[PDB]
């Protein structure tokens, strides 16, 4: 049964989305949220193809989730940041659609702030595989990670990440040694990664208590944020070398 409003989603935690979209806006000008039966999905390769963000938000995280037709919401990322920024503390957001060329976004309050937006078509990109075999996985504090990146970034653009059995270290060559909630070890690793690109995604650290950090010699850096509803944000960053 198809209703005049054929797609309608209600999300009551706009900070999450704001943290996701703020990181996305640093990476690309336009992106696509694909609302599917079971989840909302977003994959975006940055403009230089040096990094990749991948987002999955299960339908359970939503107050209302109505999607039969997969729906592709293409948007300019700066503009969506401005829309999400309209919301006050714990106001919900509704994304709805009556036809494929437009999206209605309501910021829900005593009076709604209603955005009628043109749906964009966004060209498809070749997308790098995100699940490689890494040499080490360390789970640490998300705040700890953010703090370590910020500390090391005031001094370098070369964020060095050093993995050992018992230690992950985040270095300027300053050293920050993890605190280490979990670790999976194959081989001792050392690689470096751009502070500019890491700075891009510091808002993602707000999404979960802990971050899974995976890397290796001559391998990219993966950051994985498992959130409280089953939501997953993954970030992949090529070595700087």
């Amino acid at each position: 049964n198809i209703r005049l409003i054929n797609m309608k989603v209600v999300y009551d935690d706009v900070r999450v989305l704001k943290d996701i979209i703020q990181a996305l806006a640093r990476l690309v000008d336009e992106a696509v949220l694909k609302f599917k039966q079971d989840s909302v999905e977003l994959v975006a390769l940055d403009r230089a193809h040096i990094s990749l963000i991948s987002v999955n938000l299960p339908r359970e995280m939503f107050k209302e989730y109505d999607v039969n037709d997969e729906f592709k919401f293409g948007f300019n990322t700066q503009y969506l940041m401005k829309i999400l920024k309209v919301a006050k503390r714990k106001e919900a957001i509704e994304i709805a659609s009556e036809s494929p060329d437009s999206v209605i976004i309501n910021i829900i309050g005593s009076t709604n702030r209603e955005f009628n937006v043109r749906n964009l078509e966004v060209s498809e990109q070749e997308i790098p595989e995100i699940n490689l075999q890494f040499d080490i996985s360390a789970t640490i504090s998300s705040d700890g990670f953010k703090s370590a990146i910020s500390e090391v970034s005031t001094v370098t653009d070369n964020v060095v990440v050093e993995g050992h059995e018992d230690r992950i270290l985040i270095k300027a060559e300053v050293e920050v040694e993890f605190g280490l909630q979990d670790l999976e070890f194959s081989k001792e690793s050392k690689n470096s990664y751009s502070a500019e690109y890491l700075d891009d995604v510091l808002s993602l650290t707000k999404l979960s208590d802990y971050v899974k950090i995976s890397f290796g010699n001559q391998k990219p850096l993966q950051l994985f944020f498992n959130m409280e509803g089953g939501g997953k944000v993954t970030y992949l960053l090529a070595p700087k070398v």
Partner: protein
């Protein structure tokens, strides 16, 4: 070498104060503890830190000595690192900060005044900003049971409980001072929420003194205008 300060923030406040003119400083380690000094080129403003050894959770040396270091990087790292302790230890010094919330261990490698009143850095910051709006020279004085500050035109009166915690005046006095040197000294009280003691006299230095919550003094001497 092994020095252990109770709070990283207080030591962060100290390092910042002794580095207003330059990012280079000389720390002095003696039997009595750490001493540090900086004096402006015109020698109108003197910054002094004194940390007695009994304030430190641990203190150990092998001989009284000085270290000259560049403090610029450790400034910006600790500016992003913020409750924790701080350690100091061939090419120079090594600093250890340990956050007990995150668990992160972060290591940085580096190569006779008549008048007397007590207040806080808040009030002194209001005054310095008020003075700077109107002129480059501040006149401070005694008017009966209150303290008069004049610049430009601007006049302020401080008295006990409005806002002064303490006021003692055993002889009438007035002195003039560079507003910008006062502004810089008052700036150096950032991070120190403890009561702040101000002292002066007839055409004599102003002393501004504050103890850190965990111990140790940040001191400022300002040459008068003659």
């Amino acid at each position: 070498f092994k020095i252990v300060y109770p709070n990283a923030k207080d030591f962060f406040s100290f390092i910042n104060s002794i580095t207003n003119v330059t990012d280079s400083i000389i720390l002095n380690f003696t039997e009595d503890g750490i001493f540090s000094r900086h004096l402006t080129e015109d020698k109108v403003l003197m910054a002094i830190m004194r940390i007695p050894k009994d304030v430190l959770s641990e203190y150990s040396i092998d001989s009284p000595t000085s270290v000259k270091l560049d403090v610029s990087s450790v400034k910006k790292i600790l500016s992003k690192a913020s409750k924790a302790t701080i350690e100091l230890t061939d090419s120079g010094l090594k600093i250890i900060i340990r956050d007990e919330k995150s668990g992160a261990k972060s290591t940085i490698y580096i190569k006779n005044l008549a008048v007397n009143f007590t207040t806080d850095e808040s009030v002194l910051n209001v005054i310095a900003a008020d003075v700077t709006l109107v002129g480059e020279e501040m006149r401070i004085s005694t008017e009966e049971d209150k303290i008069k500050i004049e610049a430009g035109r601007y006049v302020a009166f401080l008295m006990k409980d409005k806002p002064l915690k303490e006021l003692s005046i055993d002889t009438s006095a007035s002195s003039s001072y560079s507003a910008e040197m006062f502004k810089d000294a008052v700036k150096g009280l950032r991070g120190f929420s403890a009561p702040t003691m101000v002292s002066f006299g007839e055409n004599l230095p102003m002393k501004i003194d504050v103890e850190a919550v965990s111990g140790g003094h940040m001191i400022f001497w300002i040459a008068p205008r003659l």
